From a paper:
Thus, the C terminus of 14-3-3σ was fused to the N terminus of the HSPB6 peptide comprising the key Ser16, which is phosphorylated both in vivo and in vitro by cyclic nucleotide-dependent protein kinases A (PKA) and G (PKG). The linker used for fusing the HSPB6 phosphopeptide to the C-terminal of 14-3-3σ∆C included: the ordered Thr residue at position 1 that is always present in electron density maps, even for C-terminally truncated 14-3-3 variants; the natural Leu residue preceding the 14-3-3 binding motif of HSPB6 (RRApS16APL); and a GSGS segment designed to provide maximal flexibility to create the prototypical 14-3-3/HSPB6 chimera CH1. Two crystal forms of the pCH1 chimera are remarkably distinct differing by the relative orientation and packing of 14-3-3 dimers in the crystal. In one crystal form (pCH1℧), the C-terminal lobes of each of the two subunits within a 14-3-3σ dimer are in contact with one C-terminal lobe in each of the two adjacent dimers. They form an interface along the length of the α-helix 9 of 14-3-3 stabilized by contacts between pairs of residues Tyr213/Tyr213′ and Gln221/Gln221′. In the structure, pairs of subunits belonging to two different 14-3-3 dimers are linked by a reciprocal interdimer phosphopeptide swap, in the course of which phosphopeptides, fused to the C-terminus of each subunit, cross-patch into the AG of the adjacent monomer. Lying just outside the primary 14-3-3 binding motif, RXXpSXP, this residue has no clear electron density suggesting its conformational variability. Notably, although being very short, the GSGS linker was long enough to allow phosphopeptide binding to the 14-3-3 monomer of an adjacent dimer. Consistent with available 14-3-3/peptide crystal structures, in the pCH1℧ structure reported here, the phosphate moiety of the peptide forms salt bridging interactions with the conserved 14-3-3σ residues Lys49, Arg56, and Arg129 and a hydrogen bond with Tyr130. The comparison showed that the two different approaches provided almost identical structural information, with the Cα r.m.s.d. of 0.23 Å for bound peptides. As expected, the chimeric protein CH1 co-produced in bacteria with PKA was specifically phosphorylated at the authentic Ser residue (Ser16 of HSPB6).
The 14-3-3 family of eukaryotic proteins are abundant, medium sized proteins (~30 kDa subunit mass) endowed with a well-characterized phosphopeptide-binding ability. The human 14-3-3 family comprises 7 isoforms (β, σ, ζ, γ, τ, ε, η), that form all-helical W-shaped homo- and heterodimers. More specifically, 14-3-3 s bind protein partners that have phosphorylated serine and/or threonine residues presented in a specific molecular context. To aid structure determination, we have developed a streamlined approach based on chimeric 14-3-3 proteins fused to the sequences of interacting peptides.
Residue numbers in the entry:
A (entry chain A): -1 to 70, 78 to 243
B (entry chain E): -1 to 71, 77 to 243
C (entry chain B): -2 to 71, 76 to 243
D (entry chain F): -1 to 70, 76 to 242
The structure:
Amino acid sequence: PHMERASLIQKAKLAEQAERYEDMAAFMKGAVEKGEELSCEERNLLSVAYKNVVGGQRAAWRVLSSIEQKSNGPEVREYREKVETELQGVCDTVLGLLDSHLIKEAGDAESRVFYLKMKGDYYRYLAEVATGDDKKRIIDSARSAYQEAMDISKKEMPPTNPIRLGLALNFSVFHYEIANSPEEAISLAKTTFDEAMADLHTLSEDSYKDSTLIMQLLRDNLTLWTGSGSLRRASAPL
Amino acid sequence: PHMERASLIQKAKLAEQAERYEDMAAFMKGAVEKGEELSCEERNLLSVAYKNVVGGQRAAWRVLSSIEQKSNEAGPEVREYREKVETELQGVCDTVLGLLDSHLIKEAGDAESRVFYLKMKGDYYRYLAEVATGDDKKRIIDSARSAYQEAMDISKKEMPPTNPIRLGLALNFSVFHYEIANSPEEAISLAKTTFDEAMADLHTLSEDSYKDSTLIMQLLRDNLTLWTGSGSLRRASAPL
Amino acid sequence: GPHMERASLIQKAKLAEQAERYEDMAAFMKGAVEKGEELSCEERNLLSVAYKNVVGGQRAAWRVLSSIEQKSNEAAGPEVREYREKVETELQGVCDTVLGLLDSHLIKEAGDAESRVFYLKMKGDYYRYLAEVATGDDKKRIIDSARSAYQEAMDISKKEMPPTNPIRLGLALNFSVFHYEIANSPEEAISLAKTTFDEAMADLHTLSEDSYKDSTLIMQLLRDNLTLWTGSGSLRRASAPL
Amino acid sequence: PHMERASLIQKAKLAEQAERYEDMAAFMKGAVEKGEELSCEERNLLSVAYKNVVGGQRAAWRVLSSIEQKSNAAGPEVREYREKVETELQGVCDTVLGLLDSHLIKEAGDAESRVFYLKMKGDYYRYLAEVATGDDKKRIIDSARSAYQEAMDISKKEMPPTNPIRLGLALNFSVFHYEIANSPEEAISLAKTTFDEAMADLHTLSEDSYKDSTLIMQLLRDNLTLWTGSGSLRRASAP
């Protein structure tokens, strides 16, 4: 390690505690640029930082795009465009770090799934706002990243692993919202849930909370997408 | 025919594998009547047997009551047959409640067994309440409430929030609040509390209860989404 | 032109609020103030909301970092100090921006009592935020600048506004916080807080339905602080009066 | 002496103004035993009289029980005197519960009066629970809970969420949950639900109605901060 890198990682941990996500992101970018492999803890810092930064831009873009769609003055279009351009710049930064530093085709496989999933996520966020001729390319870039990640996770991780579950949840969202394949989405989400449910006896104690949380999100999306809400209430199985 | 306790339990296990729930129920009733306590495995056999028997009667009653409710817009066969299924269902609930009161419920044995039976008492009074329309309805609802309340009091002092009997109990009592007692707010807030307290204590869970606890936590979340109208909400992506 | 620009900026600040984009909202509201016209009651609230949210996050961060830094001085590690200093400098820059707008545009050009009190209260607030982080020889000056702004605002609000007015209540609540946390006058704070609450409670019959929610919300914050500061929160639970 | 019903009600109003609660209680017990329903104003006089009488006994019992618990044999005077106060308190609760069961609950016509008395029955069983110790405590706790639950069921169907008897009932049943039944979570949930459902319909009230209800909503908020520990949080500044 570089010690600049060690100091930047320490400052990213301080920025997380302080809920200063743009600083956290800047510190984690700097750390990625000052070294090779990130540890599991350091990969999560990078992801949390940029998740929170784009999360707010995406939430804003949705509000503005919703106002623009209903009002159809030039201020809404212009401001929606400002937020959109800013969001695109963050996604380009994350995708640049992944391609130039983090994604290693001959590296550790588990870390390769995390980054390839992250590459699919940030191309998917670009696809959420893309309306040009470039849209098809963006959608395909996200699909390839997720497909490459899915292929590795199936060979290398158990079906209860939270990175593998997270990956399948996000790729099903991609199918539903982006690729307009709601049936593939429902299918993948049901398969992921059922394969993880069958392998619950081999769930390690540390993965328990993260895996069951993501399995709940899969079940929540399945209910939303199939219209399984309004069905009869459940009582205990025993 | 070997109808000694050990043989009735063995036949109850065969009946389960064969999906012969009325035989299972009869074998388990017979095993309870030897005047002895049930193990955790044996309590589950008793519950599975009667849950399957009463479940088919309830499902049938709902179909018939639904046909009877639409029909008035009427031959007497629907009312008569709905009444036949109701009476039969009431007899099973009375059998289960009789076994619980005369043999199984004690003050006291171990907390998990006490809670299990009191939860079972609230469940079978709740099934009687589902079909009750007379002056006796209030009494039935109160009998279900007391059983669940006594069970809730023991489970809070004696069991961890992730225990599946404690989770199952809270899930069923929240259903009782929503459907039977017409207290949808109490139901939502019990379901949310149960889920949140179990979610915080997930580190202290075993391989045995893993599947049972997370399955019941999923049912709590499913009911919360149905009852709060949270279905409509934005799709989830990974927290990662 | 500037008149169409001013209108666009205020409209974008309303969009930025809906989108929870407070730094943009602040920038749009600064730009609108720099058109040199007075702000309406609605526009004053947009300005205040924008900068309250911006500085709110910086202050919350500063408190976390200062708390981590204080626990390391009892084997760190200069990163906490350095990062706490970064957040503080950034916070100071926002307070200086707000205080500059108030002094150069808003306070000098305020017509009515409600707008004049609003801005003087805001001046007291942002000097109080500078006082929250100040440890130099400049500390005493900052505290006094805050006190004078609040005192001038209190003098106008007592002559010109009813005791239920939410700007007057907000002012009193913040000046009591200044007394408790900044000036180390917890008795003056409890006093002021109790007096403000009691005088507003007596004049509740003369409250409009518009200001009822804003006034009762601020009266709730006054009694919440009174409970915290007097330790009355530890008292026996209430049951029904009949 | 003028001991006709209306004069007993007039004398109870005078005893309230004079803070003579044992006389007030005796005047309202006397008016109840005339065999007519109590009006809304009259029900409040009955409740105020006995809440003040039992309140002083409860406050005393708490002081004495605290001295007896701390005295750690000692002198027997504390136990004996705590027992005297306890027996006296139990007698007042038995008097109120006897009036409710023999005259007021049976004869109540409307929902508001039915709820009022059932809430009052839960309260006085809760006061008996405060001084009971073992399996005696079980018995009493469940009489309190049933009275409260029956009252809650009627108030939800028959009264708006801003009604002060419905608010008072929820506040007391939440106290029962927290202190007596050891269910701090449903106490906190019931109090927040009650506050939030009442706050959503406050615009409908007059100034008198608004005052009565907002006082009980403040007590719900006060208990919520005590029970959730929200009072120890960072001080508020203006929004």
